[PDB]
Design a protein around this ligand. Structure first.
Ligand code: HEM
Ligand code: HEM
Ligand SMILES: Cc1ccc(-c2csc3nnc(SCC(=O)Nc4ccc5c(c4)OCO5)n23)cc1
Ligand SMILES: Cc1ccc(-c2csc3nnc(SCC(=O)Nc4ccc5c(c4)OCO5)n23)cc1
Lengths: 373, 373
C-alpha cells in the first residue's frame, strides 16, 4: 500500500502529528489550548466572535492542515455547545466558519469534528525515544478539565495501532488467493487473528483511565453533531460559506477504518441489506480521510476471502477464518460491556438506541462464523 | 474495466438474461409468467400460499440467480399489493420470503424489486442475429394488462445501453489525464457528450409506448416499496428469516449506475452537504449490484476530471467538459417534462416531493457548468 497513507507502525493514525502552527495562526491556537478555562468562564464564544477571518493559504504541508482541522473542529464544538447545558448556537461566525469549510473542502472531509481529527491526529509522545505506550503519550486538546478525554482518545488510538499489525498482512492475503497459495493464506489469517486478539488487551485500559460519570456528563456533549439532533433540528448555519443550515453527523468510531476494513476483509455483510446499521456505517465512510475511504473501496473490489474459504472444503482453512471472526466478536462483545458501564448506567442517574446498533453489528459479525453449520 | 461486470455493448445491463429456470422451479415460473391473470382473477395470493418451500441450490450461476430474483421479486410485489385498491398483505409467506431473502443475501441485494431486476435483467432479443432495438426486444414479466411496464422498462434499458458507449471511454479519460495528453482528453470528452446526446434521442421513444393514465394508476402500485410508506408503516415481515418487519425502498432510477457514474466522473457533487437529494442517491447505491457499487466507488478515487479542467485555462477543454455537463442537464430537463405528463398531470384528475428531488438534481448538475450560462 502506498498512496493510501497507512503507516506501517501507526496504521491509520497520522504518523507523527504536528503540535504548533505557523505563528500566523496564533489567534486560533490560543483558544484551543485554553478550551477548558474559556468554556468555564463563558469567554469562549466572546473570543470566537473577536477573531479575524484568516486565510488557510499559510498552511503548506498536509500535517499542518490536519492540525488546523483538529484546532478549528474543537473550537467549533465548544462554540456550538458552549458549557453544555442547553445554550446552543445555530449560527457559526463567518470568521471561523469560512476558513473551516474552505479547509474542510480542500481535505474532502465534513466541517465537523471527526474521529480522524481528534483521535488519529490529536496526540504526541512525551519522550520521543521511548515507545508508543499510554504513559509515554499525551493528547493535544481536551474540552474540560477532568473530561476524561485523554483516556478515551488515547485508548482508542492505542487500539488503532494494535490493529496496524494486522493491516500489514492484508496484501499477503490477496496475493495468496490470487497465486492460489493455500499454505501462505492460512498463516496470514492466523497472523491477523493473533493481532486482533492482542488488541482486546489494549481495550481493558479503558477501565484504568476513564471515569463513567465524568465521561458521560461531559464528553457526550462535545461529540454531538447536528444531524437528527433535537437541539439543532435544521442543522447548522456556517455563516459566509452556506446560505442554509447543513446537517452533519457527530463523532462516531463507526468512522474508524480499522473495524470497517476487517468487516470487508472477512466479507462480513456489514454494509449490505438496508437496516439503519448498514446505512449509518456506509455514511461514516464519507467522514473518513479520502485515502482511507479509497483503501476501503479497493478491498471491496478484490474478491471475497469468505467465498474463497467457503469454496475450498479445507477445514484448517475454515478454522483460520473463524479465528478471525471470533476475535472480532470478542472485541465487540467487550466494547458492549464497556458501553453498559460508561453509558447505560450513568444515564440511569437515546441509549438503548445505541445498544441496538452495537448488538446488530455484533450479531452480523457472529453470523459470519463458518462452522456455525 | 474487468470484473466490474460491465459489458462492452450493454453496459450495466445483464448481457443475455436467461428467460427460463431449471424445471425444479416451474411452480415459480407459472405464477410469475401469469401475474396479470392471477391478480385480476383474484387468485394470486392463494396460488402463492399454496407453494412448496424450494431450495435455491439448483440456481448455480449468476444469470439464473438474477432471473430467480426477478421471478420472486415480481411475485412479491404482486402478493403484497394484490390489485392495489388497498387490500395489502403485510406478511410474506415463508415458501417465498425465505428463498428470496437467501438469494438476495447471496447477491448482496435487498429482497425487493430493483432497477437491476426490472430493467437490467428483464429482457430478451427476439431475433439474436438482429440488433438491439425496441422492435427486436421484449421484457420477460409484467404485472397487469396495459400496465405499459414493457415500454417503461425497455425504454430505460435502451437509454441505459445508449450510455454504454460513453462508458468505454472512461479509461481513456483517466489515462489521458495522467499522461498529460491534452488533445486525446478533448477527443474523449467530446465522445462522451456524443453518447449522452444520443441517449436523449432514445428517451423520446417513451411517448410511443407508455400511456399516462395506465402508467400512473397501475404501474406506480407495483413499484412501491415499504420504506416510509403509510400503508406499511413498519415494513414487511419476511417470514422465517426475520423475527421483525424490514423497511426497504421502492424502485427508483436513482438505482441506475449510469447516471451516477457520469455524475461522479464529471465531478458533479451529488453529495452536496447532507441534503435529502444527496443522501438519497447515496442510499440508492446499496440497491445496485456490488460490482457496480465498486465501480462508482473506484471512480471517486481517481483525480477529479473537473479539477484537471479548471486548472488548465484551455477554452476548448472547458467547452468539451461543458458539452458533457449540458448533455446531462438536457436529459434531466427532458426527464422533468416527462414526469409532468406521466405523474403531475394524472395525479390531479406527495408528488411535490418528487419534483423538489428531481429539480435539485437538475440544479446541482447545472451549477457544475464552467461557463456560467
Ligand atoms: C468509554 C469507552 C467507550 C464508549 C462509551 C464507547 C461507546 C460507543 C458507542 C455508543 C458506539 C455507537 C456508535 C456511535 O454512537 O456512533 C461506539 C461505536 C464504536 N466504538 Fe466505541 N466506545 C468506547 C471506546 C472505544 C474504543 C477504545 C474503541 C476502539 C477504537 C471503540 C471502537 C468503536 C467502534 C469501532 C465503533 C463502531 C461500531 C462497531 O464497529 O462495532 N470504542 N462506541
Ligand atoms: C414514464 C417515464 C418516467 C417517469 C414517470 C419517471 C419518473 C421518475 C421519478 C418520479 C423519479 C424520482 C426519483 C425516484 O422516485 O426514484 C425518477 C428518477 C429518475 N429517473 Fe425516471 N421516469 C421516467 C423515465 C425514465 C427513463 C426512461 C430514464 C432513463 C434511464 C429515467 C431515469 C431516471 C433517473 C436517473 C432518475 C434519478 C434522478 C436523476 O438522476 O436525475 N427515468 N424518475
Ligand atoms: C470525534 C470522536 C469520534 C469517536 C471517538 C471514539 C473513540 S472510541 C469510540 N466509540 N465511540 C466513539 S464516538 C461515539 C460515542 O462515543 N458516542 C457516544 C459517547 C458518549 C455518549 C453517547 C454517545 O451518548 C451518551 O454518552 N468513539 C472519539 C472522538
Ligand atoms: C424497479 C424499477 C426501478 C426503477 C425503474 C425506472 C426506470 S426509469 C425510471 N425513472 N424512475 C424510475 S422508478 C421511480 C418511479 O417510477 N417513481 C414513481 C413515483 C411515483 C409515481 C410513479 C413512479 O409513477 C406514478 O407515481 N424508473 C423501473 C423499475
Amino acid at each position: 500500500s502506498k498512496e493510501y497513507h497507512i503507516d506501517e507502525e501507526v496504521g491509520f493514525a497520522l504518523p507523527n502529528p504536528q503540535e504548533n502552527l505557523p505563528d500566523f495562526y496564533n489567534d486560533w491556537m490560543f483558544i484551543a489550548k485554553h478550551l477548558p478555562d474559556l468554556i468555564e468562564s463563558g469567554q469562549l464564544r466572546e473570543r470566537v466572535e473577536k477573531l479575524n477571518m484568516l486565510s488557510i493559504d499559510h498552511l503548506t504541508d498536509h500535517k499542518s492542515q490536519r492540525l488546523a482541522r483538529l484546532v478549528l473542529g474543537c473550537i467549533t464544538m465548544a462554540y456550538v455547545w458552549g458549557k453544555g447545558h442547553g445554550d446552543v448556537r445555530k449560527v457559526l461566525p463567518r470568521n471561523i466558519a469560512v476558513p473551516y469549510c474552505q479547509l474542510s473542502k480542500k481535505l474532502e472531509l465534513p466541517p465537523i469534528l471527526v474521529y480522524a481529527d481528534c483521535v488519529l491526529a490529536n496526540w504526541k509522545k512525551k519522550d520521543p525515544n521511548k515507545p508508543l505506550t499510554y504513559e509515554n503519550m499525551d493528547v493535544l486538546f481536551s474540552f474540560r478539565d477532568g473530561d476524561c478525554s485523554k483516556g478515551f482518545f488515547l485508548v482508542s488510538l492505542l487500539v488503532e495501532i494494535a490493529a496496524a499489525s494486522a493491516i500489514k498482512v492484508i496484501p499477503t492475503v490477496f496475493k495468496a488467493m490470487q497465486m492460489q497459495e493455500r499454505d501462505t493464506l492460512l498463516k496470514a489469517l492466523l497472523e491477523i487473528a493473533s493481532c486482533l486478539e492482542k488488541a482486546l488487551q489494549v481495550f481493558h485500559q479503558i477501565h484504568d483511565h476513564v471515569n463513567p460519570k465524568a465521561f458521560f456528563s461531559v464528553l457526550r456533549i462535545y461529540l454531538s453533531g447536528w444531524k437528527g439532533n433535537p437541539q439543532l433540528s435544521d442543522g447548522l448555519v456556517y455563516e459566509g460559506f452556506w446560505e442554509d443550515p447543513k446537517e452533519f453527523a457527530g463523532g462516531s468510531a463507526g468512522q474508524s477504518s480499522v473495524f470497517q476494513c476487517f468487516d470487508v476483509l472477512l466479507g462480513i455483510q456489514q454494509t449490505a441489506g438496508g437496516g439503519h446499521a448498514a446505512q449509518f456505517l456506509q455514511d461514516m465512510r464519507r467522514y473518513m480521510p479520502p485515502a482511507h475511504r479509497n483503501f476501503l473501496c479497493s478491498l471491496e473490489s478484490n474478491p471475497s476471502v469468505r467465498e474463497f474459504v467457503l469454496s475450498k472444503g479445507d477445514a484448517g482453512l475454515r478454522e483460520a477464518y473463524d479465528a478471525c471472526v471470533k476475535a472480532l466478536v470478542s472485541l465487540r462483545s467487550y466494547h458492549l460491556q464497556i458501553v453498559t458501564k460508561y453509558i447505560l448506567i450513568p444515564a440511569s442517574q437515546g441509549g438503548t438506541d445505541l445498544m441496538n446498533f452495537l448488538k446488530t453489528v455484533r450479531s452480523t459479525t457472529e453470523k459470519s462464523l463458518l462452522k456455525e453449520g
